[PDB]
Each structure stands twice: as C-alpha cells, then as structure tokens.
Amino acid sequence: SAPVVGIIMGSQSDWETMRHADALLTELEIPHETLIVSANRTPDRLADYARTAAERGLNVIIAGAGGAAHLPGMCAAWTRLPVLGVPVESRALKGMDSLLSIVQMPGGVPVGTLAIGASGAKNAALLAASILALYNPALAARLETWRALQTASVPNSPI
Amino acid sequence: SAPVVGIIMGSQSDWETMRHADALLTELEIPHETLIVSANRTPDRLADYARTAAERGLNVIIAGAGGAAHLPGMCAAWTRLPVLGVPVESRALKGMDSLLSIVQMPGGVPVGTLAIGASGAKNAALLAASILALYNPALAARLETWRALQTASVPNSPITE
Amino acid sequence: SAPVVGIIMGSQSDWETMRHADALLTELEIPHETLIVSANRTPDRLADYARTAAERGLNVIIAGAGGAAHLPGMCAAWTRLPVLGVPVESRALKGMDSLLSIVQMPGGVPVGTLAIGASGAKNAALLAASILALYNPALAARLETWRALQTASVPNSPI
Amino acid sequence: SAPVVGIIMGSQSDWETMRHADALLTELEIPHETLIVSANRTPDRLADYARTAAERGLNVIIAGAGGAAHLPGMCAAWTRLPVLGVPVESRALKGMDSLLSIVQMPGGVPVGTLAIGASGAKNAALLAASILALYNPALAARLETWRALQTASVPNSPITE
Amino acid sequence: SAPVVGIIMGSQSDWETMRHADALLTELEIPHETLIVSANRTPDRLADYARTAAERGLNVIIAGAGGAAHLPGMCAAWTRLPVLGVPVESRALKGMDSLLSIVQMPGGVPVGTLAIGASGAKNAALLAASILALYNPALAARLETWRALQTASVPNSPI
Amino acid sequence: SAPVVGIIMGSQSDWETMRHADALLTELEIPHETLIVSANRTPDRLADYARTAAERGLNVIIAGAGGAAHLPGMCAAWTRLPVLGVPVESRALKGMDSLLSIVQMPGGVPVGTLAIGASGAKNAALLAASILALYNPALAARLETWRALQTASVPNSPITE
Amino acid sequence: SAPVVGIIMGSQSDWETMRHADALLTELEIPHETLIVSANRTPDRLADYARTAAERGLNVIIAGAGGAAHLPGMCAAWTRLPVLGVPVESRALKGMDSLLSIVQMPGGVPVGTLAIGASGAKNAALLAASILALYNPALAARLETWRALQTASVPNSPI
Amino acid sequence: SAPVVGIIMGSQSDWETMRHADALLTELEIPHETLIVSANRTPDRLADYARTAAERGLNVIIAGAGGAAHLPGMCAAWTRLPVLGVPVESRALKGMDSLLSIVQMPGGVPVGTLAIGASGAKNAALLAASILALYNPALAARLETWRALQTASVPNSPITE
Ligand SMILES: N=C1[C@H](C(=O)O)N=CN1[C@@H]1O[C@H](COP(=O)(O)O)[C@@H](O)[C@H]1O
Ligand SMILES: N=C1[C@H](C(=O)O)N=CN1[C@@H]1O[C@H](COP(=O)(O)O)[C@@H](O)[C@H]1O
Ligand SMILES: N=C1[C@H](C(=O)O)N=CN1[C@@H]1O[C@H](COP(=O)(O)O)[C@@H](O)[C@H]1O
C-alpha cells in the first residue's frame, strides 16, 4: 500500500503529460505517489524529497519537466535510486530543450530518459514497472500480460 | 558468475563508446556479457538474443547504437526486461540521429536513454547498477561508495596551466 | 489482382498520412495491400510480413511511421525487396525524428526515403509505380499520363 | 554492356562519396555510367541527360549532391524513371542542407533519398540493385548472396584494442 | 507598363505568402507580373521563363517556394538577372528546409535570400525596388518616402 | 575609379571569407572599397558609413558578419541601397547563428542573404554584379562571359585518384 | 517616480510577451518606462535612446524582439548600462532565430539573455530587480518576499 | 579585497572557458573568487555556496557549465543575487545542450545567459562589471575606458596575408 514509485513534476502545467505515467502505474497496480516538485522554484523540497526517497521505501522515481527541465537531473543528483526522466513538450522548442537538459547528464549521474510528451510519461511508468518486475513475480506476470495485450490488440488494417 | 546485465552494440565501431559501460560494471563487480548485435544488419540474431534474455537470467540490457539506431528499441520490443539505450555519436549529425532514433520510442515500448557518447555508456551501466542495487545490498553499498567518492573527488578550485 | 505493393504503417494514427499512398496506387490501378504493422509493438508480425513479402508476390513495400519510426528500416532488414519510407509528421518534432531514423540507415540496408507527411506518402506510391513501370508497359504509359497531367495542370497564375 | 543505372553527381568533390555507389554496382555486375552534372551550374546538361535517360536504356538514376542540392529533384522532374538521391555531406551544415534539399520533394515528383555520405551512396546502389533484381533472376541471386554475406560477416563480440 | 519584375511561385499554396510581394510592388507602382512556376512540376516552363526573362525586359525576379524549394535556385541557374528568393513556411519544418535549399546556393549561382514567410516576400519586393531605384529617380524618391513613412510610423509606446 | 560597391565586414577574422567577394569584383572590373565595420562594436562608425553610402556614389553594399550578425541589417536600416549579407561561419554553431541573425530581417528592412562562408561571399559579389549589369552593358557582357565559362568548365566525368 | 528601468520592444507585436516584464516591475514597485523601439526600422531612435539611457537615470534596460532581433544587441552597443534580452517567439522558427541573434553577442558587448517568450520577459524584470536590489534595501526585501511567495505557493500535488 | 563577484564552474574542463571571465574581472580590478562547483555532482556544495553568497558579500555570480548545464539555474534557485550563466561548448552538440539547459529557465528564476564559449565568459564578466558600475563610480570610469578603447581599437581595413 506504501508507494514504491514516486512521480514528480515541475508544475501543474506538466500534469496533462505526467497523468499518463500515473494512469499506467494504477493500471498495473503499482503503489505510488504523485507530486509537484520544482528544482528551480522549490530546491529544498527537491533535495529533501530525493534524499529521503530510498528511506521512505521508494524504488524508482519518475520526474517530468518542461523548458530547461532541471528537475530530473537534480533529483538524480540527490538519490541513489534509479531516476527516469520525461521531457515535457513546450510551446516554443517543442520539448527539445527539455530533452537535452535531461538526457545529456554527465557521467556519474544518470537519468533514464524517455520520449518527449505523453508517450514518454507512459513509458517511464512502464520502464519503472519492468524494473520492479525483476523482484515481484505477480507484477512481472501482470506486465507480461499488459505487453501481450498491446501486441495482440494492434489492428491488422487501418479503418 | 552468471551475467545479469547484457551489453549489446551494433558494431565494433560502437565499442570505443560501449567499453565504458563494460568497465563500470566490472568495477562494480556486476557479472555481465558483452556482444555485438545489429538490429538492421542481424535482425534474427537480435530477435534470438532479446527473446531469450529473461530466461538466460539477464535482468538489464544496455544497448548502444548510432545513426538510424534501432537496436535498443527492437531489443525492447522482444523483452520485458528494462532496456537502456546509449546513442553512439555519429560523424555528420554528431549523434542527433542516434538520440532521436532511440529516445522517441512509441508509448508501450520503453527504452531508458542516456547521453550521447561515452558519458551515456557510463551512465547506462550506473543506471543498471542502481536497478540491480534495489535487491542487492552488497552492490548497493558498493554503488553508494562509488557515488560518494565521485562527489568528494571533485576539485574545489581550478588549476591554471 | 494480387497485390504487388504493400503499404504498411506503424499505427492507425498514420492512416491520415498513408492514405495518400493508398489513393495514388488505386488511381494508377496498381494492386496492393494496406496494413498496420508496428516494428516495436508487433515485431514478429513485421518479421513474418517482411520475410514472406517476395514469396507472396510483392515487389515494393511502402512503410510509414512517426516518432523513432523503426518500421521502415526493420522491414528492409528482413526483405530483399525495395523498401520506401515515409516519415510521419508528429506533434513534438514535426517528423524530424522520423526522418533521421529512416533515412540514416547504415550501408547495406537501404530505405528510399520520401518527404515528411502526405506528400512523402504520395511520392512513395509514385516512386513504387515508377519502379513497377520498368517492366509493365501499360502501367508505364499510365504513369507517363499521370506525370503529364500534373505538369499540364499547374496554373499559370495564382487566383 | 549497355548501362542500366546512371550515376550522376554535381561535382568532382562529390566523387569521394559517389564512388561508393559506383563500386557497389560494379561488384554486383550492374552495367552503369558515371557522370558529373550540376543542376545549378549545368542545367541544360541536366535537362538533356534526364530527358533522354529512358530512351537511352537507363532504368534507375542515382544522383548525388550537396548544399542546395537540386540535382536529384530536377533530374526527377524530367524523367519518369525512379531517381534515388544521395545527400553529400557539406562543410558547415554537415549535410543537413543537402538532406532537406533532396528529401523534401513536393508531392508528384519523387526522389528516394538515402543517408548522408558514403553510406547513402552505397545504399543508393543497393536500392537500385533491388529494383533491377525484381526482373533479373541472376542479379537477384547475386544480391541475395551479397546481403547474406553481410549478415554472416558481422562479428559476435568486440575486439578490445 | 511592361513588367520589370517577375514574381514566380511554386504553387497556389504559396500565394498567401507571395501576395505581400505583389502588394508591395503595386504600392510602389513597379510594373510586374505574378505567375505560378514549379521547378519540379513544370521544369520546361521554368527554363523558358528564366531564359527569356532579360529579353522580355524583366530586371529582377522574385521567386518563392516551400519544401525543398528548388524554384529560386533553378531560376537563377537559367537567367543572368538578379534572383531574389523567399522561403515559404511549411507545415512540418516551418520553412527551414526551404531556407537552406535557397540560401545555400553554390558559388557562381546566387539567390539573394529573404526571411521565411510574408515578411520575406514583402522584403523581396522592397529589395527589388531598391535595385530598380538605382536607375529610376522617380522610383528612388517613392522608395525613400516609403522607408521614411515606415520609420516615422512606428509608435513610441505599446497599446 | 570611384567605388560603386562597398564591402564591409565585422572584423579581420571575417576577411578570410570576404576576400572572395573582393576578388570576384576585381575580376569583373567593378570599382569597390573594402572596410572593416562592426555593428555591435563600432555602431557609430556603421551609422556614418551607411548614411553616407548613397551620397558617396555606392550602389550596392556587401556586408559580412558572424555570430549575432547585425552588420548587414543595421547597414540596411540606414541606407536605401540594396544590402547583401554574407553569413560568416561561426566556430560552435557553424554559421547557423550568423545565417538566422542576417536573413530573418523584419518586413520593411531587406537584406539579400547568401550562403554561409566563402561561397556566400563570392555570390554576394556576383549578385551585386548582376545588379550593376542591369545598367552597364560592358559589365553585363563580362558577367555573361564569366557565367558561360563557369558552365563550360564543369567536367563531364569524375577523376578517380 | 522617475524610471530606473527601460523596457523596449521591437514592435506592438511583442507587447503580448513584453507585458509580463511590465507587470512584474509594477508589482515590485520599480519605476520604469515601456516603449516601442526598432533597431532596423527606427535606428536613430534606438541610438538616441541607448546613448542617453544612463543620463536619464536608467539603470537597466530590458529589450525584447522577434525574428533576427537586432534590438537587444544594438542597444547594448550604445549604452554602458546592463542590457537584458528577451527572445520573442515567432511563427516560423519559434524564437530560435531571436535567441541566437541575442545570446551570441561578441566579447565586449554583452546582453544577459533570458528564455524565449513570456517567461523570459518575466525573468528579465526579475533579473533587473535583483540588480537594483543590490543597492536598494526596501526593494531587496520586497524581492525576497516575492521569491519566498513563489517557492511557498507551489502546490504539493497536481489537481 | 573582499570578493563581490563569484565565478563558479562545473569542472576543471570548464576553466579553459571561464578563465576569460576571471581575467576580465581582474583587469577591471573587481575583487572576486573562482571555484569549481557541480550542480549534478556536488549538489550540497552548490546549495551551501548559493545560500550563503549574499551574506558573504557577493553581489553577482557568474556560473559556467556544459552539457545538461544545471549549475547556473540551481544557483539562482538558492540566491536572490543576479546569476549570469555561461554555456560551455560541448563536444557533440557544440554547446546547444549547454545553452538551452541554461537559458530556458522557468518564469520566476532568472539566469542572464551569455554566448557559448569564451566570448560568453568574457561578456559575463563585463555584464557583472556594468552591474557593479551602477553604484561604483571608479569602476564605471574604468568600464567606460575599457569599452571606449575596444571601439577605437577596431581596424578600419582588412590585412591581406
Ligand atoms: N523547469 C522547471 C522547474 C524544474 O523543476 O525543473 N520547475 C518547473 N519547470 C517547468 O516549467 C514549465 C512551465 O511551468 P509553469 O506553467 O508553472 O510556468 C513546466 O514544464 C515545468 O515542468
Ligand atoms: N514508432 C512506431 C512503431 C514502429 O512500427 O516503428 N509503431 C508505430 N510507431 C509510431 O508511433 C506513432 C504514434 O502511434 P500511436 O498513436 O498508436 O501511439 C505513429 O506515428 C506510429 O507510426
Ligand atoms: N517545391 C516546390 C516545387 C518548386 O517549384 O520548387 N513546386 C512547388 N513547390 C512547393 O511545394 C509546396 C506545396 O505545394 P502544393 O500545395 O501544390 O502541394 C509549395 O510551397 C510550393 O512552393
């Protein structure tokens, strides 16, 4: 019942994108928390959140942000847990700024980066699930089922 | 000594980049295998590798590729295991083609992507380590020590040649 | 009556773009099939489709996909037939990601790439027709007529 | 020994790239001609070449060009034959100007575009081969053998210098 | 009364952009013609148009096109007259493809390139006017007046 | 021998690029002046130059600049004469910053932009020549001869080292 | 009561973006002026404005423009005062052209550049405030309060 | 001799770029400190530095970083002082990743960004100088003299090797 995955995002504006990560984890019955945390506007909140993640029982953190998107990398800077990053698409640069600021992390501080937008958010949840599946047979089976349903449900011809 | 991490790359040319992932895993004492598999040139070899990864005991796959990089994504298409992708720097487009071909995976088939080049390879290994550390106390301690040393090793002031 | 060209696309989302390829082939009376095939979501479906293409009588394959667009290159990886690729334009990167993932194929596995979007889809069909025309006089004549009508129909002044 | 494939390029500078297309066709025993034709600098030469390609027996045209690359597109404008385009890498923009100028053809005038550089030239020849193989059993067998050898020749593990 | 400037565009689709060039020339009372000419769809029409431009009395040609935009450069390839190019903005790449295909012309075949879109079209007309002004005092004066009105009409504060 | 074309550049560093414009004008026998003027570093020098260009007899101004290239645009802001701009290649961004800073002029202040680098400088001179040729029969003939020679000088087949 | 910060923009079109800078300065009670000044259309107006800035008592200038955006750099070329630049997002290149034309200034003529768009405009005002705060305790306190309210007001969870 | 400007950089590798900022401040006689602080690798070190900057007497912070450059932005997150950012050129992406990671700060946390590379470092120091000059007549005169000399030092015509 206690969250094993933490979904954090730069602002309310990111919810439209990050909700796909939330929905996916719920579907796979993965206990998690969903919060707003800004690296630049709430730096101490991030430090505390990331520092204590492991102690609170979290195993994976999904972080999403737009623009310069410092959130994912800074979260990874304070936690030893795997951090997955979702570039949130934005008006001007369509998430290209977010993508580079997240994926180009220096050696030593990784952020497993997913695609820009909703699909990236969804995949961050699926990637987190695949990580948890390594030591949770029940979840692993549910993940196998989800993947199998995806493959089997793709139509053979367009409508 | 059974491998828990599989490092695959599209070619020998990618090794200069992927060797950094191999070195880091060895440093952290994580048993792994290193192979060359091309999605575009040896698709059946990739299919066989990816389909049997889980049953062979692998827990994480690190895939490196450049250009129209399809290796990580296709590997992820055949395995339920987490797949981490490393964009190998390309000559003309400096790895931008590699990056987009890897990171822009459709919803439903994830590939955790790392930085272009050596730094990415190193982080892919560190990310796989943090994944394995979730259920390996010994490795977790080793990872912690490694991270802590990195931070304490950063100089405080610049050296003027 | 048996299809000599196969139009495959990553998902239903690509139909809005790939229908232009379909329409063009029908106009030129080129027998063909139109299907949904995902390299990442239905890898085995793609392997089987591409592997058996030649045996089924297909001469050219038109493949369209958005995002990382692995479909065209992976199809070419399994078939000896000419594979033409159409980058499908997408929200964030406007098909630039799709273009690079398709056109930058390594030496040994070609994908004749067309423009991003509807025009690329239309041109993939026209390119496939020009290939088939090399050994089909009737089609070659119809293609000559289509090209001639295009050139002759361009207005001399804007409205 | 009549040519069935025509390899045209904008300049001598493009030859370093296009020679790879020439070499591959020769390897597959495909009769072809190799010429220098510039759309921007020798437009009338291009018009003559493209208009007569079909009547001269050519079946596929491989065109290489860099910068504001118009050679492939204009060639396609005058011939009904399939035209394959090879973006030659440019100094400043690393071939991005070459790529967009070639691949972004308007609906109605196709140009099958290949990768930037040598790899593109090689694939343009392989693509032309696969086109010709549709109605040439002998070439088809040769192409098949070539592809099969490429796949079997890929190493299984990396060499550590 | 005979046109001294020719405005040519790739297709009707470009009119929304190229009309700004047309409007500007009319405002400055510069005799001109406005036509649709496609380098790729009507190659012979372009060759003939460009080849005969000088003989017909044209002094400057404004050419606009989107996508690969071969029109401006190919026009310059056949005429000795100054050719000005306008990259027409397009759906996918926002005219970046058009810009590079026009501005990156090789040494020996120039195309004076203007900004992407309506402003570029307007400026192509103004640039053509500044060229004609060099040997037409009446026009030069009207151009001076237009430039003076532009500068004087800029508000001092936003509304 | 009064100059009719003015070639200005932001710095000595830009000369390697702009010398190509100077050489071409001299070749076509077009009297011109070549100076260094920076919009960002010598704005008043630019203002004086641009305001008096027309009264000094100049007919066309060729301006070269790199980086946040403002020289061509600001020159155009002060003169009614046609201003041609040459984007000088930049180190990091390979001239893309130079290109956009020059070509994206607001409606009302034109700058005819040429290719990044040497080719652009050469074309700026050729464009200025074609402008001057409109009312100079002698130059027109020289320009025609120059163009015709360029086309006839293009090789027909590639040289294989 | 006399303005200590000058907000200048390329045209009325930029107001939608630059108003955020205006609003921010008013909120922090920083006396300022808001004007339209075009480097390319009103060069002499800019020269005079920038040259006299210091004499008029201005301490910081915020300049915003789209497209080639010469305004910020040219303003900095004529004044010794700190000049902050805001790339205004535009149709075609989404402000990437504006960003490079502003940030890539040569050594010797700086322009502190902010993000593309509304956020950049807002931040230019905040940066100007932080500069003024260095020698105005009352403003410094109000700035501390504004920053504190920003941090404290960020929600803990998305709605 | 108390420092009023703080120059921080992510690594020793960034020094080649940031030394230009150090040199300019020293030239203008502006007391400053130069340190190495990484946002991604020494976050706690950055937090301590940024939080105490104001109380330690610093007035302006110049931060240089490359790649996923977070140093300037995070420093700005903890201090009310103006923070100027210098994008350090990166190998593959030539500093574009550095630039976007720095300049695209969210509304509410400003970072005045300068050009990619050395020029940016130099301008960051000049910008900090102009800020300090607002309330330092002596420095203002020195800055004025410096600017005036730069303008008068620009050559009027190019040197032909
Ligand atoms: N860049 C940040 C910073 C961070 O945590 O890195 N705080 C949030 N952002 C991003 O700022 C962007 C716009 O936020 P806004 O609508 O609150 O102004 C969002 O994409 C958010 O993720
Ligand atoms: N990238 C792929 C993968 C493939 O086959 O390569 N499967 C399909 N896609 C692309 O994913 C994009 C979005 O698909 P969606 O609306 O089903 O989430 C489409 O452009 C589709 O072509
Ligand atoms: N690229 C060309 C080619 C040329 O003349 O270069 N013919 C026209 N185009 C461009 O094709 C684009 C789309 O045209 P369309 O709406 O007729 O399909 C237009 O921007 C037009 O300028």
Ligand SMILES: N=C1[C@H](C(=O)O)N=CN1[C@@H]1O[C@H](COP(=O)(O)O)[C@@H](O)[C@H]1O
């Ligand atoms: N590029 C300039 C020039 C300048 O001052 O640098 N004058 C104004 N602009 C920009 O031109 C763009 C479009 O202006 P417009 O709507 O008046 O045509 C605006 O973003 C404006 O900032």
